[model samples]
Target: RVVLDENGISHRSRYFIMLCDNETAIAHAKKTSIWAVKKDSSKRISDAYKKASVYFIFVAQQTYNALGYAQVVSDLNSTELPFWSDSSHAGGVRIKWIKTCNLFSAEISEIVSHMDHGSEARDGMEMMYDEGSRLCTLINYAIMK
Candidate 1:
């Protein structure tokens, strides 16, 4: 991976974190900023999608580190034509790829510890406490050119 030098930035709106297999979803996310949250009919999933304008931070499954965040620009979508291969990803939220941190350099262990669903992808969980700010700063720093 191409690790960049740090420089630092943080935010509001139900800031949340999730784990994504960098080998797959990460690339797909950039290719199409709109990310498919999940394929389910649960009330919780419905609520998560209903809430937009939130920050969705991603942790790479392979790298075990944060890859940065995306702004939920659009609410959960109901598209007949979707980017994902399976039907589970038929509905999702549109996102704006904000920034990507150094998978190998940015120390995010402290941040992940607070995730609601550790080692899994969840759409509605925030970091422990100060981590929200810490992660926000890390991504901003990684964005520096």
Candidate 2:
């Protein structure tokens, strides 16, 4: 990845940390500059689901013995849903809520269209992907409380 410094100094960093585990760092590195509860809360899937306007169902392609997709809803005290699986058992689906933000953005890299359903291209469930000012909004929201 190419990282540019304040003085416009550009350098390449091959060791990239997965954003899924370090949302705060990613948000800071991206310079997301906004302060909104809805946006900030969205950073945490469970927190965002509590106030979601519309619930989304996302299917996973692989099975995990851990809490897995259910953890999202479980964290929010929401209900769990079961989706249809394929004969080969390559993919499945889960659901989440989307929040509006000025500095936050989410990009779906791959969309797998199964015979009966579709699955996200990523390997596991993600709480927040990317959005401009997403980190700012959340931090501001926290201060307001």
Output the lDDT of residue 12, model 1. 26
Best candidate according to lDDT:
1
- Which digits, one per residue and each the tens of the lDDT, describe model 2 over residues 16-43? 0011223342233223321111222333
Which regions of candidate 1 deviate over 4 angstroms? 1-12, 39-52, 80-82, 85-87, 117-124, 143-145
Clashes of 1: 1
Please give, for residues 1-145, the per-residue lDDT of candidate 1 as tens digits.
3222231111224456666654566677777776765544324434544652466777765555767787777665666224543665546777887786646433565446535434533544544325555677776765663
Which window of ten consecutive residues has the lowest lDDT sum in model 1?
2-11
Off by over 4 Å in 2: 1-43, 60-110, 113-120, 123-145
- Cα-lDDT of candidate 2: 0.25
lDDT of each: 0.58, 0.25
